[PDB]
Amino acid sequence: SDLRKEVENHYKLSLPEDFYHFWKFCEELDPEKPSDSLSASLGLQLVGPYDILAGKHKTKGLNFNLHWRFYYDPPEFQTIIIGDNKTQYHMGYFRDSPDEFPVYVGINEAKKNCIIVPNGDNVFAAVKLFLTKKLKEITDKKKINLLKNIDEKLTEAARELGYSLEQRTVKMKQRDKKVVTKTFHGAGLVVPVDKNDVGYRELPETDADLKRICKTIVEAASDEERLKAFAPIQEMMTFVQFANDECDYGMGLELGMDLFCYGSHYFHKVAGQLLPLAYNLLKRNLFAEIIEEHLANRSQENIDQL
């Protein structure tokens, strides 16, 4: 516990206990380099707060909101494991608010798409799912025994700690009932909703039509053509103002997120006007900080120890 508080003080976020227990698990597997204990076997790397666990942050300006923050990792998303650097495959805890625990572990390929795929509710589940999926992907049999042994250790540790190993747990299916919309990232929004349905309202445009709007705007051949084409974004932003004035904050939360998912620099400012404010209105100030810093410095290489 004595090495936990410095970790969580650095991130301004609380980390669940499975994170630290998995640290101890990997330490027992390989005391010399626990973070990379699965790197020789799986090609995966423990990073982020594990970097603090490894003491590798002691080489040093250190901005942890960007540490391994991939191009499409939403502020809700805290990268914890890296895989293929060609596709920027990675796994991370997903937190809807800075005061809550992660709801599950998601995976994304930042060079492939913006979709975050649920991968269990804890890192044991995430690594087991990746391991099992690769076991069939691996075109060999001799080089599998090591994976069987490490997987055996994974299963026994999860059983001893009382963790379910399902890809989708009970708590995730409960959150999904609280999930109000997928918002191009597929992970769902959690916003306050009172007994009069106050707190959220849907966008004036469908998701497919929103993606079409983004395509037609980003592909405009001149800035004058964009300004003429910009009319639907301006309209949607005015209605977003209307909604926030009536406490339906999540709408302004969602629209910016879609632009965050779209990825074009032409939308960096407008999202910076929508997403931070929405987080401020939602009292998620840390996410406003994260989105400000990421939009100002959204890079394709993000290991702060380089």
């Binding site: 349905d197 707190g199 309202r201 469908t206 300004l227 301006q234 209307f242 004035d245 407008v270 209105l281």
Partner: protein
């Protein structure tokens, strides 16, 4: 009124006219929808006789509303009798109603329903009012906005509507409100939704038309219908006039029937209004600024006698709207929502809505980067005793019991300590500050707003010409 021919009939748009006989104009649009079986289709029919040569034709065109479709042109070489017969027969087949007595129309289930359509210069005026009128009286811009109301935002794909068609739409929204009020999502709700989507043409692409299930969609539909009515009144008002005007806008100005006088920038009134504009820019609407370019004095006939001067608590409050519809207000003043409109769309009831924070009302102007000119109107409103509301309750109007207006208690708002006076009316200067109203049970309204019910309690006083200045975009 003026009877236009469908332009899509290129072979006959310039050589032919729609047929008319007194009341009966042989032109008709039918709509059908059934979300149970996911039908959403239109059918237009028009009898056209050529202008030059004596030859009649029936034009039919059909498809999904919004998406242009299959058409047919049947020529008759002047066989007007046969052509009229065919017209009436098809009208009956598709509607189960006879065409000639179109007056008594009765839609039947599983058949198309009808709808109703609209088918020596000494220009003496101040130059500033001239610019204002030309800005608001620009017919081109009204046409362009109407075309945008069909091909930009598909709210009225096929065309326009009549006042009475809108009223029937409101009737259907009332039936929807009644249905939804009991939370029953079975068959009657689906039929009521069918009636709504029949009366007001929508385009859903292919995705089954969804059920209207919550209050938010009700209110959005209500605002759409309101915008339809606004466009209708704007085109009615912009009717051009002859008789030696030498500046037709002067007759348009008479149609405003509202004195609008230019104010000097150095006058106390102009400076104070600028102070009020600037001091009350909410901090959470920071994507743009606003500059006061010019300010006009308002004198609307008949309002003076109506003002509730006896009532206390008189303040100057904002009212924003798009550049184009202002022509209607200056001619007719602000109106309460229509009687037939569903009450449950307005979380605190019907009436006239005002803010005291410039940017909150200003959000209703929809100004743009390309089109940077918007207007905000200031009106003196005698609120009298306000009824205090913490949480949404659409039934606020019954709770008045002697009060004259409702106040929705927002988190951020000016405090009366900073209030000043203008011509004996209270001017609520900002900045906004915390008001110590909070809710230990539910949400908290972001900002106050004040609503009045008697139309006689509003007196428009100045019209503000405002440059909305947007900023960097990436």
């Amino acid at each position: 009124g003026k009877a236009p021919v469908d332009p899509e009939c290129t072979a006959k748009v310039g050589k032919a006219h729609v047929y008319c006989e007194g009341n009966d104009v042989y032109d008709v649009m039918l709509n059908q929808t059934n979300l149970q079986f996911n039908n959403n289709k239109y059918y237009l029919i028009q009898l056209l006789e050529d202008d030059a040569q004596r030859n009649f034709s029936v034009w039919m065109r059909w498809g999904r509303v919004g998406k242009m479709g299959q058409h047919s042109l049947v020529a008759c070489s002047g066989n007007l009798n046969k052509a009229k017969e065919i017209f009436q027969k098809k009208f009956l087949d598709k509607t189960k109603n006879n065409w000639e007595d179109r007056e008594k129309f009765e839609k039947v289930p599983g058949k198309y329903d009808m709808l109703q359509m609209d088918y020596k210069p000494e220009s003496q005026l101040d130059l500033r009012v001239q610019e204002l009128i030309k800005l608001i009286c620009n017919v081109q811009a009204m046409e362009e906005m109407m075309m945008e109301m069909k091909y930009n935002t598909k709210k009225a794909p096929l065309g326009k509507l009549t006042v009475a068609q809108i009223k029937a739409g409101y009737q259907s929204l009332k039936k929807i409100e009644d249905c939804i009020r009991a939370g029953q999502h079975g068959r009657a709700l689906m039929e009521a939704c069918n009636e709504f989507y029949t009366r007001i043409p929508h385009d859903f692409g292919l995705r089954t038309p969804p059920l209207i299930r919550t209050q938010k969609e009700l209110s959005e539909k209500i605002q759409l219908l309101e915008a339809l009515g606004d466009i209708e009144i704007a085109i009615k008002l912009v009717k051009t006039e002859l008789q030696s005007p030498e500046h037709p806008l002067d007759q348009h100005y008479r149609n405003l029937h509202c004195a609008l006088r230019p104010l000097d920038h150095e006058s106390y009134e102009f400076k104070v209004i600028s102070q009020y504009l600037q001091s009350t820019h909410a901090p959470t609407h920071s994507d743009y600024t606003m500059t006061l370019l010019d300010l006009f004095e308002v004198e609307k006939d008949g309002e003076k006698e109506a003002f509730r001067e006896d009532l206390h608590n008189r303040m100057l409050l904002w009212h924003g709207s798009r550049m184009s519809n202002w022509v209607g207000i200056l001619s007719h003043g602000l109106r309460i929502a229509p009687p037939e409109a569903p009450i449950t769309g307005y979380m605190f009831g019907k009436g006239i809505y005002f803010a005291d924070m410039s940017s909150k009302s200003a959000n209703y102007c929809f100004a743009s980067r390309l089109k940077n000119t918007g207007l905000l109107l200031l009106s003196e409103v005698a609120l009298g005793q306000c009824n205090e509301l913490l949480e949404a309750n659409p039934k606020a109007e019954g709770l008045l019991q002697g009060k004259h207006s409702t106040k929705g208690l927002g988190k951020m708002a000016p405090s009366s300590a900073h209030f000043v006076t203008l011509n004996g009316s209270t001017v609520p200067l900002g900045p906004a500050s915390d008001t110590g109203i909070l809710n230990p049970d539910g949400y908290t309204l972001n900002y106050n707003e004040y609503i009045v019910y008697n139309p006689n309690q509003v007196r428009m006083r100045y019209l503000l010409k405002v440059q909305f200045n947007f900023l960097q975009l990436w």
